[PDB]
Design an enzyme around this catalytic site. Structure first.
Site, mmCIF file in Angstrom:
data_model
loop_
_atom_site.group_PDB
_atom_site.id
_atom_site.type_symbol
_atom_site.label_atom_id
_atom_site.label_comp_id
_atom_site.label_asym_id
_atom_site.label_seq_id
_atom_site.Cartn_x
_atom_site.Cartn_y
_atom_site.Cartn_z
ATOM 1 N N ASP A 40 0.867 -1.178 0.040
ATOM 2 C CA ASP A 40 -0.020 0.065 0.076
ATOM 3 C C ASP A 40 0.846 1.159 -0.090
ATOM 4 O OD1 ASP A 40 -2.419 1.471 0.190
ATOM 5 O OD2 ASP A 40 -2.846 1.185 2.392
ATOM 6 N N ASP A 61 2.050 3.422 7.787
ATOM 7 C CA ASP A 61 1.056 2.529 7.487
ATOM 8 C C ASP A 61 1.189 1.259 7.088
ATOM 9 O OD1 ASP A 61 -1.695 1.360 7.130
ATOM 10 O OD2 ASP A 61 -2.332 2.882 5.972
#
Length: 281
Positions: free
Chosen positions: A138, A156
């Protein structure tokens, strides 16, 4: 989590401001007093009241991953609070927030060398993450945080795996049959490079997911951003090679960017029937 995360004493934490809402609860900023008595600025994520066991696992799982990294371009985990509630993850403070939203506030306001500095940091953090056997999955400008000195750091780790899908950032082979490798992260890095040089424009704008998938598979690529150096657009195209074995490794990307920083005059060389461009290579 305590293999890779320091349990913090909540007396050492001061919560000074709510910044917003995250997936698992609120995000705040504040201050952490270290064992040495030094006080540092921190981001503080809390797990919402009434959390499920799954929510706690996923929340703290991200901390467990983050805690494995100690690198200047990967977000620093200062520690966690688990022995009291609400449960907390405490990370280094990044004053300028997410990179995509930051750049959108400053369209055409930075020098190419500033932008290359940001990109070099992201590449260096990714080189280390891939060295450690993690595939991020991601990697996107929204998942890069940027501090007061414009230092960019990967964050993240929610989708990260040891060796749901953000289609616009994902390599064609990862979309096609879940072939996630560090080379698919290099693809994503190419998209981030485009995002940065485009000051946070959305990759593929608002194209249908189906059309993003079809167009990219057909060999179409995002076009050069306005006033984009040729070297940087070529680097995008290299990250976007159909054959993942032909993409540069993160170490090579860092080297390429370092050469451009060393020879900034190279950046002065600047780069039709359709929005996307068919890359013949």
């Amino acid at each position: 989590v305590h293999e890779f995360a320091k349990e913090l004493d909540a007396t050492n934490i001061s919560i000074d401001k709510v910044v917003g809402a995250g997936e698992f609860g609120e995000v705040c900023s504040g201050r952490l007093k270290l064992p040495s008595k030094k006080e540092i600025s921190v981001a503080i994520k809390t797990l919402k009241v009434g959390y499920t066991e799954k929510q706690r696992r996923d929340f703290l799982g991200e901390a467990s991953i983050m805690g494995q990294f100690d690198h200047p371009n990967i977000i620093r985990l200062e520690g966690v609070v688990t022995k009291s509630k609400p449960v907390m993850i405490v990370t280094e403070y990044m004053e300028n927030g997410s990179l995509d939203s930051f750049l959108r506030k400053h369209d055409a306001q930075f020098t190419v060398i500033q932008l290359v500095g940001m990109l070099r940091g992201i590449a260096s953090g990714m080189k280390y993450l891939s060295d450690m056997g993690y595939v991020h999955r991601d990697l996107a400008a929204r998942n890069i945080l940027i501090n007061s000195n414009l230092v960019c750091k990967v964050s993240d780790f929610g989708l990260s795996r040891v060796l749901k899908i953000p289609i616009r950032w994902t390599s064609p082979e990862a979309i096609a049959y879940r072939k996630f490798t560090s080379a698919s992260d290099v693809w994503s890095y190419g998209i981030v490079l485009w995002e940065v040089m485009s000051y946070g424009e959305r990759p593929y704008w608002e194209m249908s997911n189906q059309d993003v998938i079809k167009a990219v598979d057909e060999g179409y690529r995002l076009p050069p951003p306005m006033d984009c150096p040729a070297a940087l657009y070529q680097l995008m195209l290299d990250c976007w090679q159909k054959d993942r074995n032909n993409r540069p490794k993160f170490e090579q990307i860092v080297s390429i960017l370092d050469k451009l920083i060393r020879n900034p005059g190279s950046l002065k060389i600047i780069t039709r029937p359709s929005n996307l461009l068919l890359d013949q290579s």
